[PDB]
Amino acid sequence: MGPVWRKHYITYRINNYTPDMNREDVDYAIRKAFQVWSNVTPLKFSKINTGMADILVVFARGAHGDDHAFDGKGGILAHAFGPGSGIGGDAHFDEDEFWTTHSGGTNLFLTAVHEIGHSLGLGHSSDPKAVMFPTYKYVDINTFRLSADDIRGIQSLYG
Ligand SMILES: CC(C)ON(CC(=O)NO)S(=O)(=O)c1ccc(-c2ccccc2)cc1
Ligand SMILES: [Ca+2]
Ligand SMILES: [Ca+2]
Ligand SMILES: [Ca+2]
Ligand SMILES: [Zn+2]
Ligand SMILES: [Zn+2]
């Protein structure tokens, strides 16, 4: 195994908000993305408005304080660090993308599900049906499901 959180109670905080979307829509996309993983694990996620949080959610562009600069519009969409202190767990979204609640631009909810998978310790899948397969493609949000591979992976880490 790579690194895993050593507690099942995990906190998150949204550092800043993309101007591409309404604030309320960012909050909702992120909450629902955490819920996807909560639904198949003993993990419980709790939002912090101010102070220390395990998973910091950040929107930033270009070089933004870690060794992994974003690349402007297109290409890399986002990245996340595996479980750990400090930057460990943190999920970064490239502001040079256009984040949306729908099929236009790049869907924030779906991308966050993939990134939070990384924040929890998952690597990439070779199952094209898995959210951890490293190709972004819009599927509608109401019918989105984790694949059996995603579930096998996350349950192998927690529970
Ligand atoms: C390795 C590389 C091809 O993938 N990316 C870097 C990465 O792994 N960050 O997590 S990505 O940013 O392009 C990328 C690609 C796909 C997705 C993705 C996959 C499924 C659903 C939503 C987004 C997110 C980022
Ligand atoms: Ca980019
Ligand atoms: Ca962190
Ligand atoms: Ca943007
Ligand atoms: Zn980063
Ligand atoms: Zn990835």
Long-range contacts of 146-149 (CB under 8 A, 24+ apart): 146/36, 146/40, 146/113, 149/125
Ligand 1, atom nearest to 79 Cα: 9
Q: Which of 81, 107, 108, 115 is catalytic?
A: 115
Q: State the distance from the centre of ligand 2 to the C-alpha of 21, rounded, in angstroms.
A: 17
Closest-CA residue, ligand 1 atom 11, reads: 76
Q: State the distance from the centre of ligand 6 to the C-alpha of 24, rounded, in angstroms.
A: 25
Q: What is the distance in angstroms between the CA of the first residue and the CA of the last residue of the chain?
A: 14
Catalytic residue flag (residue 115): yes
CA distance 159 to 46: 18
| H helices present in 15-143, as ranges | 23-38, 108-120
**Resolution limit in angstroms?**
1.5
Ligand 1, atom nearest to 107 Cα: 22
Query: Who surrounds ion ligand 3 at CB < 5 A?
Result: 88-90
Which method resolved this structure? X-ray
Residue 130 is classified by DSSP as: S
Give me the sheet containing 44-47, strands edge to edge. Answer: 44-47, 9-14, 55-60, 91-94, 78-80
The identity of residue 157, as a single letter, is: L
Q: State the distance from the centre of ligand 5 to the C-alpha of 62, rounded, in angstroms.
A: 9
CA distance 37 to 56: 17
Listed by start position, the domains of the chain span: 1-159
Domain 1-159 class, CATH top level: alpha beta
Closest-CA residue, ligand 1 atom 19, reads: 136
